Amino acid sequence: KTVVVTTILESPYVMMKKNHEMLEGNERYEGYCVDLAAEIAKHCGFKYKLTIVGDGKYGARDADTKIWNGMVGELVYGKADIAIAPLTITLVREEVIDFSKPFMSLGISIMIKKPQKSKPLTVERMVSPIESAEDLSKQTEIAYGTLDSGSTKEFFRRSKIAVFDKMWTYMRSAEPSVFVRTTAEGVARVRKSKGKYAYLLESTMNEYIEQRKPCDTMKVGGNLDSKGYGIATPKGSSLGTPVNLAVLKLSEQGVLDKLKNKWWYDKGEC
Amino acid sequence: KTVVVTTILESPYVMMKKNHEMLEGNERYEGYCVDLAAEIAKHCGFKYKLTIVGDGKYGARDADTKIWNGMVGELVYGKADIAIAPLTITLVREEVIDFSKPFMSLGISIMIKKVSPIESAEDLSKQTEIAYGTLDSGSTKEFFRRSKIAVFDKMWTYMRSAEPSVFVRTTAEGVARVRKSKGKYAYLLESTMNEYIEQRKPCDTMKVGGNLDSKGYGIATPKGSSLGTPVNLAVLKLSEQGVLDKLKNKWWYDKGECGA
Amino acid sequence: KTVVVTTILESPYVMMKKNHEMLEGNERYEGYCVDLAAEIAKHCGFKYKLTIVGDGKYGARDADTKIWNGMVGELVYGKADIAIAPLTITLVREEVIDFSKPFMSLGISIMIKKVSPIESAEDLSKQTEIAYGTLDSGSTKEFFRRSKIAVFDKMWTYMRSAEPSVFVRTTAEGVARVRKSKGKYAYLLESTMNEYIEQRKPCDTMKVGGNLDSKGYGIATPKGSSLGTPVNLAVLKLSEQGVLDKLKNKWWYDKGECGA
Amino acid sequence: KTVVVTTILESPYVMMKKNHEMLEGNERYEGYCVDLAAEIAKHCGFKYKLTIVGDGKYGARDADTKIWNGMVGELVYGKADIAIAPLTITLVREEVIDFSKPFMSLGISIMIKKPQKSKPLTVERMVSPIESAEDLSKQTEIAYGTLDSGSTKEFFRRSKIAVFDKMWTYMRSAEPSVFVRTTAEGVARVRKSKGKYAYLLESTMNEYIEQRKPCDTMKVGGNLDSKGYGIATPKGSSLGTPVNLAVLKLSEQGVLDKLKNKWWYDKGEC
Ligand SMILES: NS(=O)(=O)c1cc2c(cc1Cl)N[C@H]([C@H]1C[C@H]3C=C[C@@H]1C3)NS2(=O)=O
Ligand SMILES: NS(=O)(=O)c1cc2c(cc1Cl)N[C@H]([C@H]1C[C@H]3C=C[C@@H]1C3)NS2(=O)=O
Ligand SMILES: NS(=O)(=O)c1cc2c(cc1Cl)N[C@H]([C@H]1C[C@H]3C=C[C@@H]1C3)NS2(=O)=O
Ligand SMILES: NS(=O)(=O)c1cc2c(cc1Cl)N[C@H]([C@H]1C[C@H]3C=C[C@@H]1C3)NS2(=O)=O
Ligand SMILES: N[C@@H](CCC(=O)O)C(=O)O
Ligand SMILES: N[C@@H](CCC(=O)O)C(=O)O
Ligand SMILES: N[C@@H](CCC(=O)O)C(=O)O
Ligand SMILES: N[C@@H](CCC(=O)O)C(=O)O
């Protein structure tokens, strides 16, 4: 019996290859998630096909409807079997699906456009207007937003920290909307914002995007928290413990670190 | 009914206070693990009793007899219900106990005394004039033993063919041996202990290089226990509330008895 | 009986003199290969006639038809007896022809125009803004195609998925393309040609990095020929006498039409 | 049928392991030659046992006796089947045994003791009394010699170059004898010579010894010639072409370069 794997187009997790027009099946995609699923299938023998969520979201319980979307809705309603994708482990998601041990560390970081270096011994020094998340809430000339139906958005909604509460209040009272539908949307806004907009996203994607052409963005401050990416599993399923042990074995053998170095640091010329 | 908790005496995880001789009850202990246990009890709503394992030991499988001794042995044999202690998550333990979600990330680090001409672990393995070891019955020695990378295999071969006994009984004895060796003994230990040690008196040790792998600490429960899901939910809730970060800052960086 | 020799017109291996229109016979050719052929004939004691292959081609197996074309084809089909030319030694050719002992060591090198921010071949593969190719029907393209190292596999994939045609017919055309590209075309060629080119006019190209592998040039003979052992002995004798080094110095470093 | 492999104790080609007392068979030795023979056996299936020549020599036709010694005598007389060892390909040896294509490049280099650096902007510069082989024959205060029953000795005997002829004449007219029986003997003479003696040996062993403790020797000048190490085979044997293709395949696949980097550059701290 073929199980279905749900994944989102994200770099460098899943990429459409240049010769994907004549290729059909699992050979269309390349990146971290595809070979991670390959290693999962090697460890526990099964046949799998990669699928993309219809709305391309991560998952969030809509207010006053109690309906899950994204990859969470793929697995809760029973139309999916496993989600090998950068899905963040949260409290709300664990109560509806089973999460394996995290296979990747992450954190909430800030994206800003790289400032122009000041020429005037003759050393080049870079100055930036944002150094952490403390002053980001204080200043109002720079607007900040998050990704809709993501872990960061919900985390900001249910955060009782004073600075995080102020950030959430500003996001609620922001016009026009500072939220974005995809990671590429926020990155494009950062690009064509001329330093007027800052994007809140995971540290791994931020680091990857910073080190790719045209190489004009940089990450400021530290991670706002510590979380991780896990493999989702529907509640009361038989794949939970097998994928958990598979993730543990892959982490122990160092395959995850090798894939990390291959898919983030090899092609990081600037 | 009361619930027994097994914890290893490790800093900054559990202190036996400072005037413990005149203290009776649950106030004789303090630390990150004590606070975490209190918060877990508050969330779940059960009476908990903090106890120390009879033999100070994190827990590992014995030699060709399938006996668990230490803190994991205290749980797998039914004498303990929960263990709020810095227990590393690894594949072999998951087969015998239930791990909650990790609450402190970490990795394998190297601590020496005062440019540090040692770079990463690549140079450490090929440099033989300096001795280095791990902690008895932990997770680092198991990771080195069962690794398949060639350089990690070289470290494991150096571990097994080492004279005299390079292994240390406790982390405190390991850092004491580092102090008394005066730059001739590196210690392969996890990160959190390294930041805690390097930020206290006399502040003569520091972490060098990066981390060889990424692991974390979990809450161990007996297989098929009724508290695994509640403790997982409590850990996730505390992580969402930022309480874990608050306690980490309080017991690691708040004091800072050195130049930071 | 006369012996026919097949040689590809390559410098500094074989010149067609300078006033070749008024030259008839064996004096119309000069170079390292001509001198080597003369010395082989002197040692063995046979009449040799220097000829150029009809189609300028080092020789490689054709596509799914098992036909050898070029200099190796000139030998395997019985029309040639010996070939004193810079033919690289590889496994596939050894199955069809007999190679003498190598007389000039070499390796795969990279030649660009005038700090050279390219380092080794590791940076060349991951840098895509600059085009690079090999020589048609040689040995470098075969080595890249049949390699199993991942980075060499990346170079081979770039070779096959390249627009426009990056391959060049002759080495002279390759260096001319390097000249006309003005720092936007690296050439993957063997060493000896690289030192010979970089030391002549206009002296605007240089070798960068190291050598990806080590190979050599041999004397090819038909399978089961009566001259393989004599030519091997002659090559070894010339190597012992230092004559090979003398001719290498004469045709590579003696002239030196640049700043050395 | 088990064939016999003859090899000489040479570093880093063959080393006796520290735990060689309780180990018997092919597990006693470690280095380049042992794993090269392992790869040879993997490529062409056969069972092999490693053996050491009785007199520990390389091979030279004794004058007025026409008797071969070393590994050449192991194979010519029929008491050996293959010689996977650093045996140099020469004209005289090819006429008595079959040689495969070279698997390692080499050259004749000079060993001298590393001179003391002169302190008196405050840069440390090293000066040496020998810069090439041209002035080595001219000066007489520094004595030079070679290894007996080696390729270098015979090459100097049958060299018609003026400088090489002068070097051979000096070696013939040297008292006490400047020749050595083993590589370790010449290295020890260089060590306890205080710059009074120079050793002529292959470039690979010279480079390896220079980069090991106590790291007090250095190689001067360039290689006097270009030669190579091959795999010997008795005349008219059936292993010739198989080992030739095996060497070609191993060279093509890059196993030789990997073994080189493992056995010369990994443990080269100084
Ligand atoms: N900053 S830290 O090392 O004290 C730390 C580290 C971690 C924390 C919380 C803290 Cl405070 N929670 C995460 C957990 C939360 C959810 C996402 C990953 C696991 C499940 N694990 S972690 O990434 O190992
Ligand atoms: N270096 S990294 O971010 O790619 C990374 C991150 C992590 C890895 C492994 C790697 Cl390679 N494994 C751990 C897992 C291993 C065992 C201990 C914690 C979980 C269960 N999770 S993690 O701390 O999220
Ligand atoms: N210096 S050079 O590149 O012109 C050069 C290179 C080589 C020469 C001779 C010269 Cl002059 N002979 C050797 C041969 C001699 C004997 C030892 C190795 C082969 C058989 N091959 S080589 O190492 O490829
Ligand atoms: N870099 S090295 O000295 O270990 C080295 C030296 C040599 C290698 C391979 C290596 Cl890795 N292969 C060549 C062989 C390959 C084919 C071409 C020449 C012989 C037959 N001989 S070599 O030029 O003597
Ligand atoms: N990685 C996030 C989505 C992207 C974001 O919110 O920045 C998640 O799993 O929810
Ligand atoms: N802390 C580890 C022991 C290994 C170490 O600390 O080095 C454990 O809980 O198993
Ligand atoms: N010189 C090689 C051709 C490849 C090259 O020169 O790049 C040969 O003789 O086969
Ligand atoms: N490698 C040499 C022996 C050592 C030497 O002569 O320096 C040979 O094969 O003859």
XYZ file of C-alpha atoms in Angstrom, chain B residues 59-187:
129
model
C 21.992 5.280 32.947
C 23.239 2.942 30.245
C 22.751 -0.657 29.176
C 25.062 -3.042 31.010
C 27.592 -5.340 29.345
C 25.861 -8.304 27.669
C 23.238 -8.765 30.391
C 20.408 -6.345 29.414
C 20.211 -4.600 32.799
C 19.507 -0.874 33.105
C 21.286 0.744 36.053
C 21.087 4.354 37.166
C 18.229 6.777 36.642
C 16.745 4.924 33.665
C 16.996 1.728 35.698
C 15.131 3.482 38.501
C 12.247 4.021 36.049
C 12.192 0.860 33.919
C 11.924 -1.281 37.073
C 8.821 0.526 38.341
C 10.307 2.195 41.422
C 10.097 5.654 39.805
C 7.315 7.330 37.826
C 8.983 10.457 36.387
C 12.538 11.802 36.162
C 13.015 15.549 35.609
C 16.764 15.519 34.991
C 19.160 16.352 32.134
C 18.813 13.001 30.355
C 20.075 13.014 26.771
C 17.745 11.683 24.075
C 19.175 8.779 22.077
C 17.775 5.932 20.006
C 18.519 3.059 22.393
C 16.826 4.652 25.408
C 13.717 5.515 23.372
C 13.138 1.783 22.886
C 12.828 1.256 26.657
C 11.461 4.591 27.990
C 9.251 7.408 26.717
C 10.981 10.748 26.115
C 9.124 14.036 26.283
C 9.883 16.798 23.806
C 13.364 18.291 24.338
C 13.518 21.354 26.575
C 17.220 22.294 26.296
C 19.156 21.883 23.056
C 22.839 21.012 23.255
C 25.747 19.321 21.515
C 29.097 17.683 22.130
C 31.635 20.324 23.162
C 35.286 20.448 24.211
C 36.470 22.285 27.332
C 40.123 23.086 28.070
C 42.016 25.627 30.159
C 43.585 28.941 29.144
C 44.539 31.317 21.350
C 43.658 27.656 22.033
C 45.814 26.013 19.328
C 43.435 23.060 18.964
C 40.805 24.266 16.407
C 37.994 21.684 15.981
C 37.764 17.985 16.843
C 39.657 17.149 13.640
C 42.893 18.415 15.186
C 42.045 16.924 18.590
C 41.908 13.357 17.259
C 45.241 13.602 15.427
C 46.889 15.304 18.425
C 47.933 12.606 20.898
C 49.988 14.511 23.493
C 46.799 15.642 25.293
C 44.446 13.157 26.937
C 40.670 13.406 26.689
C 37.709 11.375 27.916
C 33.989 11.319 28.646
C 31.539 10.742 31.494
C 30.847 7.278 32.879
C 27.484 5.786 31.866
C 26.231 8.742 29.859
C 25.487 9.367 26.191
C 28.694 10.823 24.740
C 30.629 7.571 25.160
C 27.779 5.624 23.550
C 27.649 8.080 20.641
C 31.406 7.765 20.112
C 31.291 3.966 20.417
C 28.439 3.455 17.944
C 29.541 6.138 15.471
C 30.675 5.096 11.996
C 32.547 8.232 10.879
C 36.264 7.499 10.571
C 37.492 10.364 12.759
C 34.895 9.624 15.435
C 36.033 6.008 15.113
C 39.574 7.215 15.844
C 38.348 9.012 18.966
C 36.527 5.857 20.080
C 39.630 3.719 19.518
C 41.616 6.212 21.593
C 38.901 5.918 24.259
C 39.126 2.135 24.455
C 42.936 1.917 24.145
C 43.694 4.496 26.833
C 46.045 4.158 29.809
C 45.292 5.005 32.516
C 41.508 5.136 32.970
C 40.520 8.398 31.281
C 36.817 8.078 32.139
C 35.543 10.078 35.119
C 32.754 9.157 37.521
C 31.040 12.570 37.667
C 31.150 15.828 35.729
C 32.500 17.620 38.808
C 35.384 15.147 38.969
C 35.952 15.724 35.255
C 36.247 19.490 35.625
C 38.450 18.990 38.699
C 40.735 16.751 36.629
C 40.798 19.444 33.937
C 41.782 21.995 36.590
C 44.541 19.796 38.025
C 45.907 18.762 34.615
C 46.694 22.383 33.635
C 46.031 22.294 29.905
C 46.881 18.603 29.415
C 43.358 17.130 29.584
C 40.411 18.047 27.369
C 36.923 16.990 28.447
